[PDB]
Amino acid sequence: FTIDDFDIVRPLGKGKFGNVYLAREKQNKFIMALKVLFKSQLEKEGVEHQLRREIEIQSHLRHPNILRMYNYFHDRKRIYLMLEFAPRGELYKELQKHGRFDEQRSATFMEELADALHYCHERKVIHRDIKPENLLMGYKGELKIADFGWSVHARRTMCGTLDYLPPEMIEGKTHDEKVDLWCAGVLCYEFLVGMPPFDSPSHTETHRRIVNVDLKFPPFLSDGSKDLISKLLRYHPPQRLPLKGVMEHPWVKANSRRVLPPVY
């Protein structure tokens, strides 16, 4: 493959380590996203090994709620990633625009997320950075896990995002796949509320609220959503509701309107 095998339609925006373009593969007239990475830039920033780990994980994952990497090619100066195009774009922009999601929208995303994470966990892949900014939306608004920047095939690596950090990470303990259970609970809360649960003016007060699980549910939340969130946001990782438990949760069953995209 070469860039000449594609018609670049338009830029989609800045992605991690490079610009993303909407492109059509001339032969099959197939619309996809094309991420362009500059080989020298990757070397200068010292992110080659970090990009290789992400490509290695994302290219071997095949799930309707995981953004697909079809293939990759390179020339003298650039590495091109042939990626699934998610037509509805950034989930965070949608959250920002609406302020908060309704129960249907949130439960659908939770079912899609738990299914994608279960698929990962089954393959010993821990995401470690589930948050709205790492999610894209498909043609029918279906969730697409799009960033695997902190992911690992398995830990002590202190990683993720402040508001989403599990207690065990803040406390410098070893962690396992159960960090994704905690982040799923923080995500569910943020979807429904519009803000993460332990939001505070200072890092020390956010750390304090996380370790004490200082969860203060707004009165507009249903009993069902609070039930799911409380079951995920457990201080002790083994007490956290498993991903199969999220999928089976009565609030998810009653509210999700998940549709599986057509297969070939």
Binding site: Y70, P261, Y264
Partner: peptide, 22 residues
């Protein structure tokens, strides 16, 4: 646009990407 219709058609009639690209 004509692009919007092609994106729609791609969702409903997906291609074997594993064979075409993989």
């Amino acid at each position: 646009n004509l692009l919007t219709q092609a994106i729609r058609q791609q969702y409903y009639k997906p291609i074997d990407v594993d064979r075409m690209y993989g």
